[PDB]
Enzyme design. Structure first.
Site, PDB file in Angstrom:
ATOM      1  N   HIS A   1      10.139   0.163  -2.693  1.00 10.56           N
ATOM      2  CA  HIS A   1      10.691  -1.129  -2.292  1.00 10.56           C
ATOM      3  C   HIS A   1       9.826  -2.287  -2.732  1.00 10.56           C
ATOM      4  CE1 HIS A   1       8.128  -1.209   1.560  1.00 10.56           C
ATOM      5  NE2 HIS A   1       8.330  -2.517   1.358  1.00 10.56           N
TER       6      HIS A   1
ATOM      7  N   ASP B   1      10.492   6.455  -0.638  1.00  3.95           N
ATOM      8  CA  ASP B   1       9.990   5.121  -0.930  1.00  3.95           C
ATOM      9  C   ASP B   1       8.665   5.278  -1.682  1.00  3.95           C
ATOM     10  OD1 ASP B   1       9.650   2.415  -1.131  1.00  3.95           O
ATOM     11  OD2 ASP B   1       9.159   2.133   1.035  1.00  3.95           O
TER      12      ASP B   1
ATOM     13  N   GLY C   1       3.471  -7.295   3.449  1.00  4.45           N
ATOM     14  CA  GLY C   1       2.404  -7.563   2.469  1.00  4.45           C
ATOM     15  C   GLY C   1       1.416  -6.408   2.309  1.00  4.45           C
TER      16      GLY C   1
ATOM     17  N   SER D   1       2.773  -3.362   2.272  1.00  2.00           N
ATOM     18  CA  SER D   1       3.695  -2.394   1.690  1.00  2.00           C
ATOM     19  C   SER D   1       3.154  -1.900   0.350  1.00  2.00           C
ATOM     20  CB  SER D   1       5.045  -3.032   1.490  1.00  2.00           C
ATOM     21  OG  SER D   1       5.694  -3.201   2.761  1.00  2.00           O
ATOM     22  N   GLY D   2       3.390  -0.589   0.139  1.00  2.38           N
ATOM     23  CA  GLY D   2       2.893   0.023  -1.113  1.00  2.38           C
ATOM     24  C   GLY D   2       1.512   0.513  -1.059  1.00  2.38           C
TER      25      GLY D   2
END
Ligand code: CA
Length: 223
Positions: free
Chosen positions: A40, A84, A175, A177-178
């Site tokens: 995402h 994801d 922020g 994320s990942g």
């Protein structure tokens, strides 16, 4: 990261910032050419920033390297965030050194109760908004599958795990994320989703990296 701490410059040397003119997601360096992040977090025009501590100051240990390719998982479903996970290939290999280093992929899935290190430049407030410049860290335990399913009924697949604190107050957030969830020195999770940040009974949900190691290996063998 809400309720965390300042990591300390370059003490999380596999943490990358993904930049599209601004920081927008984290990622994890898994070898000199490849970064793992969340699907995402896909954007065109990604520059990977390695060796960062303050993302708004050039401090002297950074490497900024354009992505040449991004590869979202073939089964990513952006409605449920199942699968994801994304790979990003660097246009040139990073120079690995004490501040820019890869993180090992797991051989076995992590154990419920294991305390893991989650890191990022995401929002530090549960209610409201404050984005730090320096990297933040959090130690959080993996929750049981049954607790995670109870927290998010009808939404948790076998490719997700929860981690954090059901009383609230400590979580990853927008922020982050990942970015990485590292447990016993392996990348076990990717910051994926959650209801709010650091809210009671709503822990963070993370992509379960140990389900993807054969995909990651065959993809990097082929690109
Ligand atoms: Ca910097």
């Amino acid at each position: 990261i809400v309720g965390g701490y300042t990591c300390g410059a370059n003490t999380v040397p596999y943490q990358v910032s993904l930049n599209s003119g601004y920081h927008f997601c984290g990622g994890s360096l898994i070898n000199s050419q490849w970064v793992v992040s969340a699907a995402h977090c896909y954007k065109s025009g990604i520059q990977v920033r390695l060796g960062e501590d303050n993302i708004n100051v050039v401090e002297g240990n950074e490497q900024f390297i354009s992505a040449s390719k991004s590869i979202v998982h073939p089964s990513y479903n952006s409605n449920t965030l199942n699968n994801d996970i994304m790979l990003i290939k660097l246009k040139s290999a990073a120079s690995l050194n004490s501040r820019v280093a890869s993180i090992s992929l797991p051989t076995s899935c992590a154990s419920a109760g294991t305390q893991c290190l989650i890191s990022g430049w995401g929002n530090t407030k549960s209610s409201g908004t404050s984005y730090p410049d320096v990297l933040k860290c959090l130690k959080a335990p993996i929750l049981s599958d049954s607790s995670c399913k109870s927290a998010y009924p009808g939404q948790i697949t076998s490719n997700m795990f929860c981690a954090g604190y059901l009383e609230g107050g400590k979580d990853s957030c927008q922020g982050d994320s990942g970015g990485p969830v590292v447990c016993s020195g392996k990348l076990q999770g990717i910051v994926s989703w959650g209801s709010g940040c650091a809210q009671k009974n709503k822990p963070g949900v993370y992509t379960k990296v140990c389900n993807y190691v054969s995909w990651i290996k065959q993809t990097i063998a082929s690109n």
